[PDB]
Amino acid sequence: SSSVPSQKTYQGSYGFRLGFLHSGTAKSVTCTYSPALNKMFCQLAKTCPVQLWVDSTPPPGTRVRAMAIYKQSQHMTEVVRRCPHHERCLAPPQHLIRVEGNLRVEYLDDRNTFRHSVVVPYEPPEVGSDCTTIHYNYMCNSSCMGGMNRRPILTIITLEDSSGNLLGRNSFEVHVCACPGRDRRTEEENLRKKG
Amino acid sequence: SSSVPSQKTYQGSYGFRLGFLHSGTAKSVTCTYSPALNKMFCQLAKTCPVQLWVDSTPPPGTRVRAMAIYKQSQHMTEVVRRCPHHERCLAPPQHLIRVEGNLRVEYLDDRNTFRHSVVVPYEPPEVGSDCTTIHYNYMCNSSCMGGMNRRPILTIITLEDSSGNLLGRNSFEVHVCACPGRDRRTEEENLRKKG
Amino acid sequence: SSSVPSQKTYQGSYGFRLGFLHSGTAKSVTCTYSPALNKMFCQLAKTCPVQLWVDSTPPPGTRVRAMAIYKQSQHMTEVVRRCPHHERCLAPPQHLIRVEGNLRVEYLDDRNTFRHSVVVPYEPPEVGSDCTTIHYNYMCNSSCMGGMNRRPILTIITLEDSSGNLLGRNSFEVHVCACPGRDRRTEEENLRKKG
Amino acid sequence: SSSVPSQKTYQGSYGFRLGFLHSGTAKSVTCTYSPALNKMFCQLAKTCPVQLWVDSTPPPGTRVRAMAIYKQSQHMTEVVRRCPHHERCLAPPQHLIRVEGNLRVEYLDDRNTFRHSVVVPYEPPEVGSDCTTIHYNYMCNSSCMGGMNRRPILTIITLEDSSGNLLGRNSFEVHVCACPGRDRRTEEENLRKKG
DNA sequence: GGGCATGCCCGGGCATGCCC
DNA sequence: GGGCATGCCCGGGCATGCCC
Ligand SMILES: [Zn+2]
Ligand SMILES: [Zn+2]
Ligand SMILES: [Zn+2]
Ligand SMILES: [Zn+2]
Numbered sequence: 001s002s003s004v005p006s007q008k009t010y011q012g013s014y015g016f017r018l019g020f021l022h023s024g025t026a027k028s029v030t031c032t033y034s035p036a037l038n039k040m041f042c043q044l045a046k047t048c049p050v051q052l053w054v055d056s057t058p059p060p061g062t063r064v065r066a067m068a069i070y071k072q073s074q075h076m077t078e079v080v081r082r083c084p085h086h087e088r089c090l091a092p093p094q095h096l097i098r099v100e101g102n103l104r105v106e107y108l109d110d111r112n113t114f115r116h117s118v119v120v121p122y123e124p125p126e127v128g129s130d131c132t133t134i135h136y137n138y139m140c141n142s143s144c145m146g147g148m149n150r151r152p153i154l155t156i157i158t159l160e161d162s163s164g165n166l167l168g169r170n171s172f173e174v175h176v177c178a179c180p181g182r183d184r185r186t187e188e189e190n191l192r193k194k195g
Numbered sequence: 196s197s198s199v200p201s202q203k204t205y206q207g208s209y210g211f212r213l214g215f216l217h218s219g220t221a222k223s224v225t226c227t228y229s230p231a232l233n234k235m236f237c238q239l240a241k242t243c244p245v246q247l248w249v250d251s252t253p254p255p256g257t258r259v260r261a262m263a264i265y266k267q268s269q270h271m272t273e274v275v276r277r278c279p280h281h282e283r284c285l286a287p288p289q290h291l292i293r294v295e296g297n298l299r300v301e302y303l304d305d306r307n308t309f310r311h312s313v314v315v316p317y318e319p320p321e322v323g324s325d326c327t328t329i330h331y332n333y334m335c336n337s338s339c340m341g342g343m344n345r346r347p348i349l350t351i352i353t354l355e356d357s358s359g360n361l362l363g364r365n366s367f368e369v370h371v372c373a374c375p376g377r378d379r380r381t382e383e384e385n386l387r388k389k390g
Numbered sequence: 391s392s393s394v395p396s397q398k399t400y401q402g403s404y405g406f407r408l409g410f411l412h413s414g415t416a417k418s419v420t421c422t423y424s425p426a427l428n429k430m431f432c433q434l435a436k437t438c439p440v441q442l443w444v445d446s447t448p449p450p451g452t453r454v455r456a457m458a459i460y461k462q463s464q465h466m467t468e469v470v471r472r473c474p475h476h477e478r479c480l481a482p483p484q485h486l487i488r489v490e491g492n493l494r495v496e497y498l499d500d501r502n503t504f505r506h507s508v509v510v511p512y513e514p515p516e517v518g519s520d521c522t523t524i525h526y527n528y529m530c531n532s533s534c535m536g537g538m539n540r541r542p543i544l545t546i547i548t549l550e551d552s553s554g555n556l557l558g559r560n561s562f563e564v565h566v567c568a569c570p571g572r573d574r575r576t577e578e579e580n581l582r583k584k585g
Numbered sequence: 586s587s588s589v590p591s592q593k594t595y596q597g598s599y600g601f602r603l604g605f606l607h608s609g610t611a612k613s614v615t616c617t618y619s620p621a622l623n624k625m626f627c628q629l630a631k632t633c634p635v636q637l638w639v640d641s642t643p644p645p646g647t648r649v650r651a652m653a654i655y656k657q658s659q660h661m662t663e664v665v666r667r668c669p670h671h672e673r674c675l676a677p678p679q680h681l682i683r684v685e686g687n688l689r690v691e692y693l694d695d696r697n698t699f700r701h702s703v704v705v706p707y708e709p710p711e712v713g714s715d716c717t718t719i720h721y722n723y724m725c726n727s728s729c730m731g732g733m734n735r736r737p738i739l740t741i742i743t744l745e746d747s748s749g750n751l752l753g754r755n756s757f758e759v760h761v762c763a764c765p766g767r768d769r770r771t772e773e774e775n776l777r778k779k780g
Numbered sequence: 781g782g783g784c785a786t787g788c789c790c791g792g793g794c795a796t797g798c799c800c
Numbered sequence: 801g802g803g804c805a806t807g808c809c810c811g812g813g814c815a816t817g818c819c820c
Binding site for chain 4: 815816817818
Binding site: 001003006010073074075077 | 216225226241242244295296297298299316318321322323324330
């Protein structure tokens, strides 16, 4: 059995999709999302709100899981972990991705694949709104030595029922950096000029 | 009975064929496939994704075997092994080909032919995709002294049922090297100018 | 009592001084010493030869101690350590400075000051030469996150008798980096243009 | 105590010096010596005759020892060994340097420094000649992967009495290669043009 | 002996954490 | 927000085992 989780978008029978909030591109804005690149640019240990959108309401007991994988083919089979520095200085210190502001968060270390994930219960949007927001946190920069070490990652968000069935899957690239607005504008300019 | 395994393409009743991802020809790209040559150019100990495509779904318990053989007639009967340097510094150290990212990988040392092979279970593409990707690893350069020693090899991929029936066979040439982009462009140029 | 060791040059009654071998300024030469800056530029985990010169021969049992301290006033009281990444992947893993090629090397963790040092016996130059060379090793880049973190250090070399009397002291600045030739030429140019 | 043996020439009270025979510079001559570079160019596993010259006859029981060390500073503390390939395919297989045609040859693995050496008894030149020749053999190319790996070496010849006293020391650089005449002419031309 | 292929050295230059 | 320093990617090119 493969230890590499799928990243292919699966909107599923519930119409599962992600949403992200517009940001305003200061050089060091705390987070900013590029629709053209399907890529979040954000700062380490700071809030990265992700919206959950569904056409049909999931069944009770549905869970929302987040997992990071390296985007490039030569690194895909390597588990994404926190670097030794940020690990040394609740959430186990080896986990890259945290969820803030949720009382039912669980951190999994898969017994077979060794991959990390963080799971919270799915809550339908309150009577009166269109989506559900999760406050994620990335605890390393993409550049961290001994961790992501300048390798781009994807975050895989899966909607799963209590029985474990995959109900939906979406993914976005993440670049954790000191200056999200600068790096977003640079990669988007490179895309237009040399893409 | 012959100890030289067949390399002849046998697409079989299941329409078995291999696929490879386009790469972009940097001089030292980690892997790049040449369709004109049916030849993978890749770097040692780095991921080499190979796609499995089928027209019909194989029965349960189907396995996928990979095995290296020397391409040239005068070397065909010699077992392809890891060189002593890379052998010394679950995969046995003598095996050239490894599979990354699979929990059910098996390494075989044939009791009679002494040939090495690595086997994983066949998994059908997930509901929502067209092929299955295996992450292969070549643990020597083609040039390694005491190993391949600058001799070209073929990788033979066989689809086999649990009973051992050959369901399909495909093969591609491999050149493991420091600069796959350079060597691919050089051989393709030699093919055009002097082939 | 102060836990900050002295860096002031004390050539002493034995005429103790340090020497360094000229290098040739390739961009990524493994080590190169700048006399104008009294500064070694070297690569991590690679040999950095340091010459011991004396006018008078030290008594038997003399020892040679090396110790790193931060050069800048605001960091001087912080112990120089290996960063967590290089620590994790006879020399204790927390020590920045190692000595290669000596059978009588000792690594000290000071019980009171917590500072690290590495000591070898002093050997007089062999009948027929002018100095004694010690092969030092710096196990982090100056830029290492969670370690030196881009802060310049000094290496303090003390000649001590077996009783612990300070016989001599010398020091040089160290910049461990990927391209010692580039960084040396850049700092020397900044010194000339704006020093 | 240092584990790096001295390479400094010590002609000593017996006037100890090496001699080498003129060769004639075919591209692949089996061995050829460059006086300008004090450097032997030779082929692997082939005879490399070295002459021993003395002004005064050594005492009975004098021994002749040969030992290889890396010439460059960043490799000097590493023991010079045979590569895994030539080790796998009398003299222990890990030893680079052998002596041919001598019935009293000894191979030492130093218990403390781990360095290899090969020793034969010193014989004075027969009544009627000026020097004594030893037939050395280098069992790897300088290029061998996992061995010298393209790093230049020195051979240190020491004349020692039976008690262990150093009587004399000389050294020459060695380049073991397929084409000694080509590589000698190339390095000598580079010396004139860019030295 | 002439010349090719290939592992790796080499300097130019990019990206990114952080000083200013 | 502008700009510097630095680890490392990148293509040019050298050296060397071996084919011819
Ligand atoms: Zn980190
Ligand atoms: Zn190998
Ligand atoms: Zn470090
Ligand atoms: Zn060898």
